[PDB]
Enzyme design. Structure first.
Site, short mmCIF file in Angstrom:
data_model
loop_
_atom_site.label_atom_id
_atom_site.label_comp_id
_atom_site.label_asym_id
_atom_site.label_seq_id
_atom_site.Cartn_x
_atom_site.Cartn_y
_atom_site.Cartn_z
N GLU A 35 41.21 30.74 46.38
CA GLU A 35 40.54 31.98 46.03
C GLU A 35 41.37 33.21 46.36
O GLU A 35 41.53 34.09 45.54
CB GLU A 35 39.19 32.11 46.74
CG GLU A 35 38.11 31.14 46.30
CD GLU A 35 37.67 31.33 44.87
OE1 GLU A 35 37.92 32.41 44.30
OE2 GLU A 35 37.07 30.38 44.31
N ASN A 46 36.24 41.67 37.55
CA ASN A 46 35.93 40.84 36.40
C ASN A 46 35.50 41.79 35.29
O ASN A 46 34.33 42.20 35.23
CB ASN A 46 34.81 39.87 36.73
CG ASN A 46 35.16 38.99 37.92
OD1 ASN A 46 35.99 38.07 37.81
ND2 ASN A 46 34.56 39.28 39.06
N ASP A 49 32.12 41.03 33.02
CA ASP A 49 30.72 41.29 33.41
C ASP A 49 30.52 42.42 34.41
O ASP A 49 29.44 42.55 34.98
CB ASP A 49 30.02 40.01 33.91
CG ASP A 49 30.37 39.64 35.34
OD1 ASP A 49 31.38 40.14 35.88
OD2 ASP A 49 29.63 38.83 35.93
N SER A 51 31.63 42.82 37.51
CA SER A 51 31.45 42.45 38.90
C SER A 51 32.84 42.33 39.51
O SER A 51 33.84 42.22 38.79
CB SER A 51 30.70 41.11 39.01
OG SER A 51 31.51 40.00 38.62
N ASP A 53 35.04 40.35 42.89
CA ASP A 53 35.08 39.31 43.90
C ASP A 53 35.78 39.90 45.12
O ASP A 53 36.86 40.47 44.99
CB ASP A 53 35.86 38.12 43.39
CG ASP A 53 35.22 37.51 42.18
OD1 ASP A 53 33.98 37.49 42.14
OD2 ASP A 53 35.95 37.07 41.27
N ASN A 60 31.27 37.13 45.07
CA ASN A 60 30.89 38.02 43.98
C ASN A 60 29.80 39.07 44.28
O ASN A 60 28.75 38.77 44.86
CB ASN A 60 30.49 37.17 42.77
CG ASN A 60 30.40 37.98 41.49
OD1 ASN A 60 29.32 38.37 41.07
ND2 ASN A 60 31.53 38.17 40.83
#
Ligand code: NA
Length: 130
Positions: A35, A46, A49, A51, A53, A60
């Site tokens: 990750e 992102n 959408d 959002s 991380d 998220n």
């Protein structure tokens, strides 16, 4: 902070991650590796959408932490997403524990399925004394 492998393994064990909700320490290590590369300040937007991380586990903002700019989002960990960018990983671990408390468990992270599931993950904890 960019943790070194064994340094991280020892910290996670102390934080009670080994076997948490059936998840071995080596699995948590594999997740962090893919990750963020064990990097606590890693952020990933992102565009698809709206959002983002956050942190070592790339949690998220839609369901887990609040950053104020993600549409129709919740804050299940009841934390500002800023809390997931500290060098001290205590809050990120507490939030990761909350994430796996849901039915999907560790599968909630697609990277885990792609790079950790059904693989020999022993290498992530070898020689660390955990
Ligand atoms: Na949120």
């Amino acid at each position: 902070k960019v943790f070194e492998r064994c340094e991280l393994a020892r910290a996670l064990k102390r934080l009670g991650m080994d076997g948490y909700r059936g998840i071995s320490l080596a699995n948590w290590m594999c997740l962090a590796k893919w990750e963020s590369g064990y990097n606590t300040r890693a952020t990933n937007y992102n565009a698809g959408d709206r959002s983002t991380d956050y942190g070592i586990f790339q949690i998220n903002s839609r369901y887990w932490c609040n950053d104020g700019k993600t549409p129709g989002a919740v804050n299940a960990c009841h934390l500002s997403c800023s809390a997931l960018l500290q060098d001290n990983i205590a809050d990120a671990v507490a939030c990761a524990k909350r994430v796996v408390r849901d039915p999907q468990g560790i599968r909630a992270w697609v990277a885990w399925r792609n790079r950790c599931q059904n693989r020999d993950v022993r290498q992530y904890v070898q020689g660390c004394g955990v």
